[PDB]
Design a protein around this ligand. Structure first.
Ligand SMILES: *c1ccc([N+](=O)[O-])c(Nc2ncc(C(F)(F)F)cc2Cl)n1
Length: 267
């Protein structure tokens, strides 16, 4: 049910629990000692996922699979990584990376002038690098949005939760046919780009969720954000082609976003 993995077991006594981060299921802040095994007396701030006491056997099974998928996926710079686990003599602890600036939507909204272009292209670019990595590990996100992208102290984008309804982010085949593909996450990426370039704006402003599918079927897409360059808008529109095979891949999006990054950095 919960065996001992030598590659992942962390001593629970080297984990000092703190304030809750989210959920009501729970994510709690903690200070971990020795997350870097070379310097074991060195502390780091970590995020600890655990269940609430009112949780079921099914909730445990789900938390276990999330931990098991995380081990499989392997480490990447732009994903929230698994640091360790506490499985014996107590509650299951799934220890993950902590991102001090919270989610991307919140990061962008708190810095709206009453943050520069290299910073926005760098958010977008990193999310693409992270999504390209997940895709190579055969991982379909299903809910890519700015709120599921976390920001660290060093402005590092880290995609979370990879292992009413968000209608406004879902690719047509996902909303209607309930089919989730890598190409459908590219659609969600197009919406994520728009969220970035509007500094955390709400997709399809003024349009109610119910009137959305008809507008999409008529071939209507969001207009270009107020001061967004057409290269980036062209990418958004490409992400929103009705036909999945006509949308870019995460490889093309990384190549295209890298070019914008050098263009914004060179002069
Ligand atoms: C570290 C320090 C502070 C905060 N915070 O104030 O939100 C966080 N946030 C945080 N990190 C990681 C996760 C996740 F990996 F569990 F999703 C969630 C949150 Cl809220 N980290």
């Amino acid at each position: 049910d919960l065996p001992l993995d030598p590659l992942w077991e962390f001593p629970r006594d080297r984990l000092v629990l703190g304030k809750p981060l989210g959920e009501g299921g729970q994510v709690v802040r903690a200070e971990a000692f020795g997350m870097d095994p070379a310097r074991p007396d060195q502390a780091s701030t970590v995020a600890v996922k655990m269940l609430k006491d009112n949780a079921s056997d099914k909730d445990l099974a789900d938390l276990v699979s999330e931990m098991e998928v995380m081990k499989l996926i392997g480490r990447h710079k732009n994903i929230i990584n698994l640091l360790g686990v506490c499985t014996q003599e107590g509650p299951l602890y799934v220890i993950v990376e902590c991102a001090a600036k919270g989610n991307l939507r919140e990061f962008l909204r708190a810095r709206r002038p009453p943050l520069s272009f290299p910073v926005l292209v760098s958010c977008a670019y990193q999310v693409a690098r992270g999504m390209q990595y997940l895709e190579s590990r055969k991982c379909i996100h299903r809910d890519l949005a700015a709120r599921n992208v976390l920001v660290t102290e060093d402005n590092v984008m880290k995609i979370a939760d990879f292992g009413r309804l968000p209608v406004k982010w879902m690719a047509p085949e996902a909303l209607f046919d309930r089919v989730y593909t890598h190409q459908s996450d590219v659609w969600s990426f197009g919406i994520l780009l728009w969220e970035i370039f509007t500094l955390g704006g709400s997709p399809y402003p003024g349009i109610p969720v119910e009137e959305l599918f008809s507008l999409l079927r008529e071939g209507h897409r969001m207009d270009r954000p107020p001061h967004c360059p057409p290269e980036l808008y062209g990418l958004m529109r490409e992400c929103w082609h009705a036909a999945p095979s006509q949308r870019p891949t995460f490889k093309q999006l990384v190549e295209a976003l890298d070019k914008v990054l050098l263009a914004v950095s060179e002069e």
